[PDB]
């Protein structure tokens, strides 16, 4: 039995929504932790973001 949740007691609208989300989240994390690529320094994420925005703005 699904239950509706008040928007002052949950960011989810039904317990099914919430349970589904937490299972998706746990799965998303498991996948990220299993990737074998090395982690990147914060400032390279900076570089990538800076250039992505630059790319996006070169359009209109």
């Amino acid at each position: 039995k699904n239950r509706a949740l008040s928007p002052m007691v949950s960011e989810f609208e039904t317990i099914e929504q919430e349970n589904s989300y937490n299972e998706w989240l746990r799965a998303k994390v498991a996948t990220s932790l299993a990737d074998p690529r090395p982690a990147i320094p914060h400032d390279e994420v900076e570089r990538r973001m800076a250039e992505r925005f630059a790319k996006m703005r070169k359009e209109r």
């Binding site: 960011e11 989810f12 589904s20 989300y21 937490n22 998706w24 989240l25 746990r26 998303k28 994390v29 996948t31 990220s32 932790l33 990737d35 690529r37 982690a39 990147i40 320094p41 914060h42 994420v45 900076e46 990538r48 973001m49 992505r52 925005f53 996006m56 703005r57």
Partner: protein, 95 residues
């Protein structure tokens, strides 16, 4: 001091979120990245600021914005950002 690193998956998340918001408002995208950036960099000096995650034991959750959550872990050698997710929907999705 622990250095701050991002997992490649977390940066893909970043790329997915900002590109979708930019379909509507590039400015808002930049503003959110400016917020996410600002939540994680003080972890370098205060790794245990944000609370342990209830849903993913071993990680900690930053509620950076009422719609976005940063998941991170404190390792022996670094703070790693693991994922950046929408707080209410299952987004960014799979690839």
């Amino acid at each position: 001091m622990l250095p701050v690193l991002w997992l490649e998956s977390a940066d893909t998340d970043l790329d997915d979120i900002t590109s979708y918001i930019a379909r509507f408002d590039i400015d808002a995208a930049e503003r959110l990245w400016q917020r996410l950036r600002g939540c994680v960099l003080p972890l370098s000096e205060h790794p245990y600021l944000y609370p342990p995650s209830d849903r993913v034991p071993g990680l900690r959750e930053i509620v950076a914005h009422p719609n976005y959550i940063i998941l991170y872990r404190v390792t022996t050698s670094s703070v790693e950002v693991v994922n950046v997710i929408h707080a209410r929907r299952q987004f960014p999705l799979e690839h």
